[PDB]
Protein backbone atom coordinates (compact mmCIF):
# COMPACT_ATOMS: atom_id res chain seq x y z
CA UNK A 1 0.00 0.00 0.00
CA UNK A 2 1.15 3.53 -0.84
CA UNK A 3 2.45 5.82 1.91
CA UNK A 4 0.51 9.05 2.42
CA UNK A 5 1.95 12.53 1.94
CA UNK A 6 4.55 13.18 4.65
CA UNK A 7 6.59 16.26 5.56
CA UNK A 8 10.04 15.65 7.00
CA UNK A 9 13.69 16.75 6.64
CA UNK A 10 15.13 15.82 3.26
CA UNK A 11 17.88 13.21 3.48
CA UNK A 12 21.23 14.66 2.39
CA UNK A 13 23.30 12.42 0.11
CA UNK A 14 26.53 14.32 0.80
CA UNK A 15 25.94 14.42 4.55
CA UNK A 16 26.70 11.15 6.35
CA UNK A 17 24.20 9.96 8.95
CA UNK A 18 26.83 9.18 11.57
CA UNK A 19 30.56 9.69 11.03
CA UNK A 20 31.54 8.01 14.28
CA UNK A 21 30.12 4.54 13.65
CA UNK A 22 29.54 1.91 10.96
CA UNK A 23 25.87 2.09 9.91
CA UNK A 24 25.81 -0.70 7.32
CA UNK A 25 27.44 -4.14 7.31
CA UNK A 26 29.54 -5.50 4.42
CA UNK A 27 26.51 -7.53 3.31
CA UNK A 28 24.44 -4.33 3.19
CA UNK A 29 22.41 -4.82 6.36
CA UNK A 30 21.65 -1.64 8.33
CA UNK A 31 23.25 -1.32 11.76
CA UNK A 32 20.64 0.47 13.85
CA UNK A 33 21.84 3.57 15.69
CA UNK A 34 19.90 6.65 16.77
CA UNK A 35 20.03 9.16 13.92
CA UNK A 36 19.94 6.58 11.12
CA UNK A 37 16.17 6.29 10.90
CA UNK A 38 13.04 8.42 10.63
CA UNK A 39 10.61 6.59 12.91
CA UNK A 40 7.60 8.32 11.38
CA UNK A 41 8.28 6.80 7.96
CA UNK A 42 8.95 3.37 9.48
CA UNK A 43 5.84 3.45 11.68
CA UNK A 44 3.78 4.26 8.58
CA UNK A 45 5.30 1.39 6.64
CA UNK A 46 4.70 -1.21 9.33
CA UNK A 47 1.26 0.01 10.41
CA UNK A 48 0.02 -0.15 6.82
CA UNK A 49 0.80 -3.87 7.01
CA UNK A 50 -0.95 -4.18 10.38
CA UNK A 51 2.23 -5.69 11.79
CA UNK A 52 1.99 -7.83 14.92
CA UNK A 53 5.10 -8.29 17.05
CA UNK A 54 5.48 -11.14 19.49
CA UNK A 55 7.79 -10.55 22.46
CA UNK A 56 8.97 -13.71 24.18
CA UNK A 57 10.52 -13.94 27.63
CA UNK A 58 11.33 -16.77 30.01
CA UNK A 59 10.77 -16.23 33.72
CA UNK A 60 11.75 -19.29 35.73
CA UNK A 61 12.21 -19.55 39.50
CA UNK A 62 13.13 -16.20 41.09
CA UNK A 63 13.27 -14.49 37.70
CA UNK A 64 9.49 -14.05 37.84
CA UNK A 65 10.29 -11.09 40.08
CA UNK A 66 11.57 -9.14 37.07
CA UNK A 67 8.33 -9.43 35.10
CA UNK A 68 6.54 -6.39 36.54
CA UNK A 69 9.22 -3.83 35.65
CA UNK A 70 9.90 -5.57 32.34
CA UNK A 71 6.27 -5.45 31.20
CA UNK A 72 5.53 -1.99 32.64
CA UNK A 73 8.47 -0.44 30.82
CA UNK A 74 7.72 -2.42 27.65
CA UNK A 75 4.29 -0.79 27.72
CA UNK A 76 5.93 2.63 27.69
CA UNK A 77 8.66 1.96 25.13
CA UNK A 78 8.17 -1.22 23.09
CA UNK A 79 6.42 -1.02 19.73
CA UNK A 80 3.94 1.54 21.02
CA UNK A 81 1.24 2.06 18.40
CA UNK A 82 1.61 -1.43 16.97
CA UNK A 83 -0.01 -4.78 17.78
CA UNK A 84 2.02 -6.57 20.46
CA UNK A 85 1.60 -10.05 21.89
CA UNK A 86 3.68 -10.90 24.95
CA UNK A 87 4.48 -14.57 25.54
CA UNK A 88 5.65 -15.28 29.08
CA UNK A 89 7.10 -18.77 29.58
CA UNK A 90 7.17 -19.55 33.28
CA UNK A 91 7.06 -22.34 35.84
CA UNK A 92 4.89 -20.14 38.07
CA UNK A 93 1.81 -18.98 36.10
CA UNK A 94 0.13 -17.62 39.23
CA UNK A 95 3.21 -15.50 39.97
CA UNK A 96 2.92 -13.45 36.77
CA UNK A 97 2.04 -9.84 37.73
CA UNK A 98 -1.19 -8.18 36.62
CA UNK A 99 0.19 -5.43 34.39
CA UNK A 100 -2.15 -2.97 32.68
CA UNK A 101 -1.71 -3.04 28.90
CA UNK A 102 -2.55 -0.47 26.25
CA UNK A 103 -5.08 -1.26 23.53
CA UNK A 104 -4.03 -3.73 20.83
CA UNK A 105 -1.64 -5.46 23.20
CA UNK A 106 -2.08 -8.80 24.91
CA UNK A 107 -0.21 -11.21 27.13
CA UNK A 108 -0.27 -15.00 27.14
CA UNK A 109 1.17 -17.10 29.94
CA UNK A 110 2.65 -20.44 28.90
CA UNK A 111 3.56 -22.87 31.67
CA UNK A 112 6.80 -24.83 31.34
CA UNK A 113 5.12 -23.69 17.76
CA UNK A 114 2.68 -23.35 14.86
CA UNK A 115 0.81 -20.89 17.07
CA UNK A 116 3.45 -18.21 16.49
CA UNK A 117 3.09 -18.49 12.71
CA UNK A 118 -0.63 -17.71 12.91
CA UNK A 119 -0.46 -15.11 15.69
CA UNK A 120 2.46 -12.78 14.97
CA UNK A 121 4.57 -11.54 12.05
CA UNK A 122 7.83 -11.07 13.95
CA UNK A 123 9.31 -12.62 17.07
CA UNK A 124 11.58 -10.73 19.45
CA UNK A 125 13.36 -12.84 22.05
CA UNK A 126 14.88 -11.14 25.09
CA UNK A 127 16.04 -11.71 28.67
CA UNK A 128 13.56 -10.80 31.42
CA UNK A 129 15.97 -9.22 33.93
CA UNK A 130 15.87 -5.99 31.93
CA UNK A 131 13.90 -2.78 31.59
CA UNK A 132 13.10 -0.53 28.66
CA UNK A 133 14.33 3.02 29.17
CA UNK A 134 13.74 4.46 25.70
CA UNK A 135 12.18 3.75 22.30
CA UNK A 136 12.50 0.20 20.92
CA UNK A 137 10.34 0.08 17.83
CA UNK A 138 9.80 -1.15 14.30
CA UNK A 139 13.23 0.08 13.21
CA UNK A 140 14.45 -3.33 14.47
CA UNK A 141 12.02 -5.46 12.44
CA UNK A 142 13.51 -7.44 9.58
CA UNK A 143 13.75 -11.13 8.58
CA UNK A 144 16.62 -11.80 11.00
CA UNK A 145 18.50 -9.60 13.44
CA UNK A 146 21.15 -9.88 16.11
CA UNK A 147 22.41 -7.33 18.65
CA UNK A 148 26.00 -6.24 19.27
CA UNK A 149 27.27 -7.44 22.66
CA UNK A 150 28.12 -4.30 24.70
CA UNK A 151 31.47 -5.75 25.78
CA UNK A 152 32.84 -6.45 22.30
CA UNK A 153 31.40 -3.89 19.88
CA UNK A 154 34.81 -2.24 19.62
CA UNK A 155 36.93 -5.38 19.86
CA UNK A 156 38.91 -7.33 17.25
CA UNK A 157 37.52 -10.75 16.29
CA UNK A 158 40.43 -12.48 18.04
CA UNK A 159 39.08 -11.10 21.33
CA UNK A 160 35.55 -12.40 20.67
CA UNK A 161 34.60 -15.13 23.14
CA UNK A 162 33.41 -17.51 20.41
CA UNK A 163 33.67 -21.26 21.01
CA UNK A 164 37.23 -22.06 19.92
CA UNK A 165 37.24 -25.87 20.12
CA UNK A 166 36.92 -27.58 16.68
CA UNK A 167 35.04 -30.42 18.38
CA UNK A 168 32.06 -28.12 18.96
CA UNK A 169 29.41 -27.34 16.35
CA UNK A 170 29.65 -23.72 17.51
CA UNK A 171 33.34 -23.58 16.55
CA UNK A 172 34.61 -20.36 14.95
CA UNK A 173 38.35 -19.91 14.20
CA UNK A 174 40.39 -16.80 15.02
CA UNK A 175 40.30 -15.60 11.41
CA UNK A 176 36.50 -15.65 11.12
CA UNK A 177 33.68 -13.57 12.56
CA UNK A 178 31.92 -10.29 11.84
CA UNK A 179 30.65 -9.32 15.30
CA UNK A 180 29.98 -10.87 18.68
CA UNK A 181 26.21 -10.95 19.15
CA UNK A 182 24.67 -11.23 22.61
CA UNK A 183 22.05 -13.92 23.15
CA UNK A 184 19.90 -11.56 25.21
CA UNK A 185 18.23 -9.82 22.26
CA UNK A 186 17.59 -11.34 18.82
CA UNK A 187 14.62 -11.85 16.54
CA UNK A 188 13.14 -11.63 13.08
CA UNK A 189 10.23 -13.12 11.17
CA UNK A 190 8.62 -16.10 12.84
CA UNK A 191 9.96 -18.33 10.06
CA UNK A 192 13.57 -17.15 10.44
CA UNK A 193 13.51 -17.26 14.24
CA UNK A 194 12.18 -20.82 14.17
CA UNK A 195 14.87 -21.78 11.66
CA UNK A 196 17.52 -20.34 13.97
CA UNK A 197 16.14 -21.99 17.11
CA UNK A 198 15.82 -25.30 15.26
CA UNK A 199 19.41 -25.09 14.01
CA UNK A 200 20.80 -24.24 17.44
CA UNK A 201 18.76 -26.94 19.17
CA UNK A 202 20.09 -29.59 16.79
CA UNK A 203 23.67 -28.30 17.04
CA UNK A 204 23.53 -28.36 20.84
CA UNK A 205 22.21 -31.92 20.75
CA UNK A 206 25.21 -32.92 18.63
CA UNK A 207 27.62 -31.33 21.10
CA UNK A 208 25.76 -33.04 23.95
CA UNK A 209 26.32 -36.44 22.35
CA UNK A 210 29.97 -35.59 21.73
CA UNK A 211 30.41 -34.75 25.39
CA UNK A 212 31.02 -31.03 24.96
CA UNK A 213 29.29 -27.79 25.98
CA UNK A 214 29.92 -24.51 24.14
CA UNK A 215 31.80 -21.94 26.23
CA UNK A 216 28.83 -19.57 26.29
CA UNK A 217 26.12 -22.13 25.60
CA UNK A 218 23.21 -20.93 23.43
CA UNK A 219 25.02 -17.66 22.70
CA UNK A 220 27.96 -19.52 21.20
CA UNK A 221 25.61 -21.29 18.81
CA UNK A 222 23.73 -18.06 18.06
CA UNK A 223 27.01 -16.52 16.96
CA UNK A 224 27.87 -19.51 14.77
CA UNK A 225 24.43 -19.29 13.15
CA UNK A 226 24.64 -15.55 12.47
CA UNK A 227 28.12 -15.98 11.03
CA UNK A 228 26.79 -18.44 8.44
CA UNK A 229 23.36 -16.80 8.01
CA UNK A 230 23.99 -13.04 7.95
CA UNK A 231 21.36 -11.01 9.81
CA UNK A 232 19.39 -8.54 7.69
CA UNK A 233 19.72 -5.89 10.42
CA UNK A 234 22.15 -5.58 13.35
CA UNK A 235 21.15 -3.61 16.45
CA UNK A 236 23.70 -1.31 18.11
CA UNK A 237 24.50 -1.54 21.85
CA UNK A 238 21.82 1.12 22.40
CA UNK A 239 19.57 -1.95 22.48
CA UNK A 240 21.48 -3.95 25.11
CA UNK A 241 23.31 -2.02 27.80
CA UNK A 242 24.19 -1.85 31.51
CA UNK A 243 24.76 1.73 32.64
CA UNK A 244 26.10 0.66 36.03
CA UNK A 245 28.81 -1.54 34.53
CA UNK A 246 29.49 0.42 31.34
CA UNK A 247 28.26 3.95 31.99
CA UNK A 248 26.89 6.14 29.20
CA UNK A 249 29.51 6.70 26.46
CA UNK A 250 29.12 9.44 23.85
CA UNK A 251 28.69 6.91 21.03
CA UNK A 252 25.31 6.00 22.55
CA UNK A 253 22.78 8.78 22.03
CA UNK A 254 20.14 6.68 23.75
CA UNK A 255 20.08 3.79 26.23
CA UNK A 256 16.99 1.83 25.20
CA UNK A 257 17.03 -1.59 26.88
CA UNK A 258 19.18 -2.19 29.96
CA UNK A 259 20.06 -4.57 32.76
CA UNK A 260 18.27 -4.10 36.08
CA UNK A 261 20.51 -3.27 39.08
O1 LIG B 1 17.07 -19.66 36.40
C1 LIG B 1 16.89 -18.97 35.40
C2 LIG B 1 17.98 -18.52 34.66
C3 LIG B 1 17.77 -17.73 33.53
N1 LIG B 1 16.47 -17.39 33.12
C4 LIG B 1 16.26 -16.60 31.89
O2 LIG B 1 17.47 -16.64 31.10
C5 LIG B 1 17.91 -15.29 30.94
C6 LIG B 1 19.42 -15.18 30.67
O3 LIG B 1 20.19 -15.69 31.77
P1 LIG B 1 20.81 -14.69 32.87
O4 LIG B 1 20.04 -13.29 32.72
O5 LIG B 1 20.74 -15.22 34.25
O6 LIG B 1 22.34 -14.41 32.42
P2 LIG B 1 22.73 -13.16 31.48
O7 LIG B 1 21.94 -13.73 30.19
O8 LIG B 1 22.20 -12.05 32.30
O9 LIG B 1 24.29 -13.54 31.45
C7 LIG B 1 17.46 -14.60 32.23
O10 LIG B 1 17.44 -13.18 32.03
C8 LIG B 1 16.02 -15.13 32.22
O11 LIG B 1 15.28 -14.51 31.17
C9 LIG B 1 15.37 -17.85 33.86
O12 LIG B 1 14.23 -17.55 33.53
N2 LIG B 1 15.59 -18.64 35.00
C1 LIG C 1 21.55 -9.03 31.23
O1 LIG C 1 22.11 -7.72 31.17
C2 LIG C 1 22.51 -7.40 29.91
O2 LIG C 1 22.36 -8.19 28.98
C3 LIG C 1 23.13 -6.02 29.67
C4 LIG C 1 24.56 -6.10 29.12
C5 LIG C 1 25.51 -6.84 30.06
C6 LIG C 1 26.96 -6.71 29.58
C7 LIG C 1 27.90 -7.58 30.42
C8 LIG C 1 29.36 -7.29 30.07
C9 LIG C 1 30.33 -8.23 30.80
C10 LIG C 1 30.36 -9.63 30.18
O3 LIG C 1 29.04 -10.20 30.16
C11 LIG C 1 29.10 -11.59 29.81
O4 LIG C 1 29.68 -11.77 28.51
C12 LIG C 1 29.76 -13.16 28.14
C13 LIG C 1 30.50 -13.35 26.82
O5 LIG C 1 31.86 -12.93 26.97
C14 LIG C 1 28.34 -13.75 28.05
O6 LIG C 1 27.59 -13.02 27.07
C15 LIG C 1 27.66 -13.62 29.41
O7 LIG C 1 26.31 -14.08 29.32
C16 LIG C 1 27.68 -12.16 29.87
O8 LIG C 1 27.17 -12.06 31.20
CL1 LIG D 1 12.81 -15.95 24.43
HG1 LIG E 1 21.33 10.24 9.42
HG1 LIG F 1 11.87 -16.57 20.88
HG1 LIG G 1 15.45 -14.93 24.72
HG1 LIG H 1 22.92 -22.46 15.69
HG1 LIG I 1 19.55 -24.05 21.62
HG1 LIG J 1 20.49 -20.02 19.18
MN1 LIG K 1 20.07 -11.30 31.59
UniProtKB/Swiss-Prot annotation:
Q: Does the keyword tRNA processing apply?
A: no
Q: What result is annotated for mutating residue 150 to S?
A: Altered substrate specificity in group B transferase
Lineage, top-rank taxon, reads: Eukaryota
The listed outcome for residue 150 to A is: In allele B(A)
Localization recorded for this chain is:
Golgi apparatus, Golgi stack membrane; Secreted
Cofactor: how bound: Binds 1 Mn(2+) ion per subunit.
| Top EC class, one word | transferase
| One GO biological process term | carbohydrate metabolic process
Per UniProt, an alpha-L-fucosyl-(1->2)-beta-D-galactosyl derivative binds at: 149, 161, 219, 242
Chemical reaction(s) catalysed:
an alpha-L-fucosyl-(1->2)-beta-D-galactosyl derivative + UDP-N-acetyl-alpha-D-galactosamine = an N-acetyl-alpha-D-galactosaminyl-(1->3)-[alpha-L-fucosyl-(1->2)]-beta-D-galactosyl derivative + UDP + H(+); an alpha-L-fucosyl-(1->2)-beta-D-galactosyl derivative + UDP-alpha-D-galactose = an alpha-D-galactosyl-(1->3)-[alpha-L-fucosyl-(1->2)]-beta-D-galactosyl derivative + UDP + H(+)
| Lumenal membrane side | 1-261
Q: Where does Mn(2+) bind?
A: 127, 129
Q: In which tissues is it expressed?
A: Expressed at high levels in testis. Also expressed in pancreas, uterus and lung and salivary gland.
Q: Which cofactor does it need?
A: Mn(2+)
Pathway stated in the Swiss-Prot or TrEMBL entry? Protein modification; protein glycosylation
Biological role stated in the UniProt entry: This protein is the basis of the ABO blood group system. The histo-blood group ABO involves three carbohydrate antigens: A, B, and H. A, B, and AB individuals express a glycosyltransferase activity that converts the H antigen to the A antigen (by addition of UDP-GalNAc) or to the B antigen (by addition of UDP-Gal), whereas O individuals lack such activity.
How does the record comment on the protein's domains?
A: The conserved DXD motif is involved in cofactor binding. The manganese ion interacts with the beta-phosphate group of UDP and may also have a role in catalysis.
- Family to which the UniProt record says this protein belongs: Belongs to the glycosyltransferase 6 family.
**Name of this protein:** Histo-blood group ABO system transferase
Which species? Answer: Homo sapiens (Human)
Task: Give the gene symbol.
Answer: ABO
Amino acid sequence: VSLPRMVYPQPKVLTPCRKDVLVVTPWLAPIVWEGTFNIDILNEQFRLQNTTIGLTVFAIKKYVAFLKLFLETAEKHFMVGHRVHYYVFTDQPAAVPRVTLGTGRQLSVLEVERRFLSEVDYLVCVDVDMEFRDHVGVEILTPLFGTLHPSFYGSSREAFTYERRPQSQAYIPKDEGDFYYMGAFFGGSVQEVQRLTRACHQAMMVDQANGIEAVWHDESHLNKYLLRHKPTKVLSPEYLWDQQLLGWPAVLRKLRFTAVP
